[PDB]
Amino acid sequence: QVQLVQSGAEVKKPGASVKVSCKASGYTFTDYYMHWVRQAPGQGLEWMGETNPRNGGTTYNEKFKGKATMTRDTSTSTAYMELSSLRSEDTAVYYCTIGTSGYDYFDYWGQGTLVTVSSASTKGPSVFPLAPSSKSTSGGTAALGCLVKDYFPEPVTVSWNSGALTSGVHTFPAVLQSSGLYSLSSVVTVPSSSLGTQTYICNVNHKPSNTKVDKKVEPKSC
Amino acid sequence: DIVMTQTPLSLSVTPGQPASISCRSSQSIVHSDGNIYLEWYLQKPGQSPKLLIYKVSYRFSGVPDRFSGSGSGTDFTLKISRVEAEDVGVYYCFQASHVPYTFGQGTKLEIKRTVAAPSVFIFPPSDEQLKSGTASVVCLLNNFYPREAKVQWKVDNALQSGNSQESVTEQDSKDSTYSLSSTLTLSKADYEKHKVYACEVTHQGLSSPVTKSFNRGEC
Numbered sequence: 001q002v003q004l005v006q007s008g009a010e011v012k013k014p015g016a017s018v019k020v021s022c023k024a025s026g027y028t029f030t031d032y033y034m035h036w037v038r039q040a041p042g043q044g045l046e047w048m049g050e051t052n053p054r055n056g057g058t059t060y061n062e063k064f065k066g067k068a069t070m071t072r073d074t075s076t077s078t079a080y081m082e083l084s085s086l087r088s089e090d091t092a093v094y095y096c097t098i099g100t101s102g103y104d105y106f107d108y109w110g111q112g113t114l115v116t117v118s119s120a121s122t123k124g125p126s127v128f129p130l131a132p133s134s135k136s137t138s139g140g141t142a143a144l145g146c147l148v149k150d151y152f153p154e155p156v157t158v159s160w161n162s163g164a165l166t167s168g169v170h171t172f173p174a175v176l177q178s179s180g181l182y183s184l185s186s187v188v189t190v191p192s193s194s195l196g197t198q199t200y201i202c203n204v205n206h207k208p209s210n211t212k213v214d215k216k217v218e219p220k221s222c
Numbered sequence: 223d224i225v226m227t228q229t230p231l232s233l234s235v236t237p238g239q240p241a242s243i244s245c246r247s248s249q250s251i252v253h254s255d256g257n258i259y260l261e262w263y264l265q266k267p268g269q270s271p272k273l274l275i276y277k278v279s280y281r282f283s284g285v286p287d288r289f290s291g292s293g294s295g296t297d298f299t300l301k302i303s304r305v306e307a308e309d310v311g312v313y314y315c316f317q318a319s320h321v322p323y324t325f326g327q328g329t330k331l332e333i334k335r336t337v338a339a340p341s342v343f344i345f346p347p348s349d350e351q352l353k354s355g356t357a358s359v360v361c362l363l364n365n366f367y368p369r370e371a372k373v374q375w376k377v378d379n380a381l382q383s384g385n386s387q388e389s390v391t392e393q394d395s396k397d398s399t400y401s402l403s404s405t406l407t408l409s410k411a412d413y414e415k416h417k418v419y420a421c422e423v424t425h426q427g428l429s430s431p432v433t434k435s436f437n438r439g440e441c
């Protein structure tokens with residue numbers, strides 16, 4: 001019931017601004033402080049500040065003061081974190097989190113928003129099927145998947161059959177290509193016996209390019 | 223700011239065996255109210271951190287009894303009595319007694335399971351990709367342990383170099399295995415010069431290498 005839904009990943013040029021949103025549901029918005037947490041490899045996890053949803057005041061971590069501006073809209077139960085004058089060093093995953101037992105712990109977190117600061121323009125991926133064939137069977141198991149090629153920046157999310165297929169799914173960490181573009185694959189192992197009855201669709205999402213691709217992976221007669 | 227230092231940096235534990243992680247604060251962390259706001263979080267790749275322990279020793283509702291916290295002053299410890307597959311990931315300690323609230327650097331827990339040989343699968347380039355002038359050949363190494371699986375590409379038995387990229391998954395939360403994907407990328411013109419495309423796999427669980435191959439144009 002308690003949900004924190006954040007805005008999607010974005011690519012921003014150095015010097016620009018970005019406003020990340022955190023839509024709250026399943027609780028009375030004014031009951032708990034809203035927190036923002038940064039995650040970047042190296043500096044790791046950092047607490048940026050806490051917003052009082054009643055008076056709208058924020059207690060900031062000195063490190064993020066000025067750079068990050070936190071607000072809340074009580075009419076839409078949405079908290080905002082705005083980063084101004086973006087620099088390469090601001091590339092990170094930004095989480096919103098709340099504590100429902102005074103100031104004891106953080107029990108609920110948003111899904112995170114990856115903000116990428118770069119001069120390179122966004123590029124949507126090409127989606128190619130990795131069709132099951134005699135070359136992708138092992139015992140009575142068939143492997144199939146999708147190849148998500150040439151996108152920028154990260155991330156791409158891949159679901160199978162709109163999230164109904166999760167068992168045996170492996171969405172590989174992205175690889176950086178020579179071109180500066182990323183590539184990844186998402187695979188699943190299924191019974192080879194039911195390739196004639198079951199339908200397998202990879203749902204590819206690249207939020208920075210507003211790319212949404214649904215690819216039906218058809219068995220190969222080879 | 224208060225620095226939270228975790229020891230060790232990494233841990234590899236056999237299922238059913240204990241795990242211990244230390245967290246040291248650079249200063250005392252007694253809040254003005256008199257309590258110590260020391261928490262432990264578990265984060266899995268691509269997921270948000272998840273609460274385990276709060277106020278040094280309190281177990282959060284729903285967390286298994288195998289997890290426990292202790293400590294005083296500047297020395298805190300997280301204990302897992304018997305590790306389970308589901309415990310994989312990165313453990314972080316965190317203080318909220320003084321502003322700014324600070325996190326530890328993290329401790330990676332690996333589950334030391336039995337050796338598992340990879341299952342190997344190969345995918346020729348798709349007909350839709352071949353229409354674009356590029357050929358990507360995918361070799362999948364599925365559910366193996368330990369992580370060190372070596373892939374070599376051979377085109378008409380000639381060892382390849384500089385035309386492939388690989389990626390390993392995080393350790394699986396259910397079976398404690400890893401999977402690896404290797405992709406060979408050539409132009410349609412380079413792809414058409416050769417017949418036999420093969421990926422040879424070496425691993426601790428394989429007495430002899432496993433090769434998966436196909437003849438170009440046979441599909």
Ligand SMILES: Cn1c(CNc2ccc(C(=N)N)cc2)nc2cc(C(=O)N(CCC(=O)O)c3ccccn3)ccc21
Nearest residue numbers: 030031032033050054098099102103104105106259318
């Ligand atoms: C600083 N602080 C925080 C920051 N959150 C936080 C969460 C988790 C953690 C952590 N991870 N340890 C650390 C900090 N939350 C607080 C809640 C209260 C409080 O008691 N009330 C109730 C007041 C009434 O009776 O209405 C309240 C509720 C809403 C607005 C204002 N006051 C006081 C102080 C608080």
